[PDB]
Amino acid sequence: MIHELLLALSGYPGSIFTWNKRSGLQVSQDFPFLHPSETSVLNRLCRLGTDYIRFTEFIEQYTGGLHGIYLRAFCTGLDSVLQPYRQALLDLEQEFLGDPHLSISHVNYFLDQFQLLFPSVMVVVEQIKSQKIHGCQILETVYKHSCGGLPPVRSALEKILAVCHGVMYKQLSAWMLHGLLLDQHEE
Amino acid sequence: PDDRSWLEHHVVHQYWTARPSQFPHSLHLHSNLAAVWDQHLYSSDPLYVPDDRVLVTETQVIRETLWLLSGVKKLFIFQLIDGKVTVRNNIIVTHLTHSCLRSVLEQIAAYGQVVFRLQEFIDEVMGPFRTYQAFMWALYKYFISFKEELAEIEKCIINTTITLAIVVDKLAPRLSQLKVLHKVFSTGVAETRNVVRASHLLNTLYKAILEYDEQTVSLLFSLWVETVRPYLQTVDEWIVHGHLWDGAREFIIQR
Amino acid sequence: KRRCWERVGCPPGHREEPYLTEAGRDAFDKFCRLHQGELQLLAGGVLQAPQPVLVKECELVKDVLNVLIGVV
């Protein structure tokens, strides 16, 4: 309940909270040791975990289909932005060692901080998926949104943009020390 | 009775013989979930049979998952049914009714299949090609440092016990490299002559360094140097002994 | 710090379930009787097997050291 939800929020598609391509993580089983107003609370919460599943799927799917050395870097950065969510779920697990009588609304309230970061960075990955942007213009379409308005989404897009610049500066080192071009043949 | 009573009442044997669990109970929620979970089963139809099997606690599954990921195989759970290990689902775990747990142990057994493939390539010599041998040597040098960590973690269960989520998140910088090892081994068994049967693996290894050019590429480099040991040794033999080493023409040069 | 996947919600908490290879030097006696029983079932009832235990580590060591000198 307060570990089962935390399993569904992480990189597992559950079966209690059913994964669907039309509506991810639906609660439909209306538990008689849940309060009926927690259903709407779970409907608020499950969009976050759905986004976490999609980001997890994006790292698992692509190492062709979306290659370029920059999106090997992008999945490397996407794993790094999913790490503090794992840390926060660990903090929830230690809190439930402390007090197991806390309701589900406390869990949704604790993970209201990551409902500010994840929906804003979801749209960038959706724009990368919908449009054919997979080369150095992925650094562009991250940099358009990394100049943002919220300190958490600024930090997450900072991590992703940073590893992409790391690849670019190594290939510029091959440009300036070995004279080598098309280290990655075009883009 | 007497000795057997002590053996059953302080330790398991309700996990290899179909017996009720001796892991202590009380009533209501975590204590005994059996009544309320039976009520939930009855209300939503338990089909026509209440869901009940042999039942095991978490820690036995934790040390079995660490044994499976560690390198040893053929456990009670993660049975090998046709060539690939998969979870034994005739065991109940009462909360989640072992359906979400089936998914998480199915992912863990999917990693155990990679562990089985590497240990299978290990087992086909111990218990020559001379380039596969140098490959399985650096594979050994990985696995000794690898399951050192899992032995250290399994010690901390005995000294209170630590949950499954912490120990599966602890082994992430090794499983991230295990996916790289999974892609490495795939062309090492995919294969006519002994020279192309080594070239197929070694060119893939030479190409995979450029894929990550973190911690994976250093493992790939240390693995890569220790698989071209026969070629550097053979080239040096061609220099100073005046003769190319012969292995039914393991080497590239027709001579 | 472990909460089981068997049951969730409001635990009183109780430890680890010990293992069977855990503490491997105190349960020889139980099984030396049990292996004797599995042998007696196949042997009809009279085969037996001396030493279900003895003695210590150190006393056994001193007797084995006395064997090499010549004291049986």
From Swiss-Prot, chain A:
It comes from the Eukaryota. Coiled coil: none annotated. Ubiquitously expressed. It is found in: Cytoplasm, Cytoskeleton, Microtubule organizing center, Centrosome. Belongs to the TUBGCP family. It is linked to Microcephaly and chorioretinopathy, autosomal recessive, 3: A disorder characterized by congenital microcephaly and chorioretinal dysplasia associated with poor vision and nystagmus. Variable ocular anomalies include microphthalmia, retinal folding, retinal detachment, optic nerve hypoplasia, absence of retinal vessels, round areas of chorioretinal atrophy, and attenuated electroretinogram. Most patients have mild developmental delay and mild learning difficulties. Component of the gamma-tubulin ring complex (gTuRC) consisting of TUBGCP2, TUBGCP3, TUBGCP4, TUBGCP5 and TUBGCP6 and gamma-tubulin TUBG1 or TUBG2. TUBGCP2, TUBGCP3, TUBGCP4, TUBGCP5 and TUBGCP6 assemble in a 5:5:2:1:1 stoichiometry; each is associated with a gamma-tubulin, thereby arranging 14 gamma-tubulins in a helical manner. Gamma-tubulin at the first position is blocked by TUBGCP3 at the last position, allowing 13 protafilaments to grow into a microtubule. Component of the gamma-tubulin ring complex (gTuRC) which mediates microtubule nucleation. The gTuRC regulates the minus-end nucleation of alpha-beta tubulin heterodimers that grow into microtubule protafilaments, a critical step in centrosome duplication and spindle formation. This is Gamma-tubulin complex component 4. It comes from Homo sapiens (Human). The gene is TUBGCP4. The chain holds residues 1 to 202 of 667 of the full protein.
Curated annotation (Swiss-Prot), chain B:
It comes from the Eukaryota. Coiled coil: none annotated. The chain holds residues 210 to 496 of 1024 of the full protein. Component of the gamma-tubulin ring complex (gTuRC) which mediates microtubule nucleation. The gTuRC regulates the minus-end nucleation of alpha-beta tubulin heterodimers that grow into microtubule protafilaments, a critical step in centrosome duplication and spindle formation. It is found in: Cytoplasm, Cytoskeleton, Microtubule organizing center, Centrosome. It comes from Homo sapiens. This is Gamma-tubulin complex component 5. The gene is TUBGCP5. Belongs to the TUBGCP family. Widely expressed, with highest levels in heart and skeletal muscle and moderate levels in brain. Component of the gamma-tubulin ring complex (gTuRC) consisting of TUBGCP2, TUBGCP3, TUBGCP4, TUBGCP5 and TUBGCP6 and gamma-tubulin TUBG1 or TUBG2. TUBGCP2, TUBGCP3, TUBGCP4, TUBGCP5 and TUBGCP6 assemble in a 5:5:2:1:1 stoichiometry; each is associated with a gamma-tubulin, thereby arranging 14 gamma-tubulins in a helical manner. Gamma-tubulin at the first position is blocked by TUBGCP3 at the last position, allowing 13 protafilaments to grow into a microtubule.
Swiss-Prot record, chain C:
Coiled coil: none annotated. Transmembrane segments: none annotated. It is found in: Cytoplasm, Cytoskeleton, Microtubule organizing center, Centrosome. Component of the gamma-tubulin ring complex (gTuRC) which mediates microtubule nucleation. The gTuRC regulates the minus-end nucleation of alpha-beta tubulin heterodimers that grow into microtubule protafilaments, a critical step in centrosome duplication and spindle formation. It is linked to Microcephaly and chorioretinopathy, autosomal recessive, 1: A syndrome characterized by microcephaly, cognitive impairment, underdeveloped retina and choroid, and epilepsy in some patients. The more anterior parts of the retina, near the periphery and pars plana, have a grayish hue and diminutive vasculature similar to retinopathy of prematurity. Visual impairment becomes evident during the first year of life. Belongs to the TUBGCP family. Component of the gamma-tubulin ring complex (gTuRC) consisting of TUBGCP2, TUBGCP3, TUBGCP4, TUBGCP5 and TUBGCP6 and gamma-tubulin TUBG1 or TUBG2. TUBGCP2, TUBGCP3, TUBGCP4, TUBGCP5 and TUBGCP6 assemble in a 5:5:2:1:1 stoichiometry; each is associated with a gamma-tubulin, thereby arranging 14 gamma-tubulins in a helical manner. Gamma-tubulin at the first position is blocked by TUBGCP3 at the last position, allowing 13 protafilaments to grow into a microtubule. This is Gamma-tubulin complex component 6. It comes from Homo sapiens (Human). The chain holds residues 293 to 364 of 1819 of the full protein.
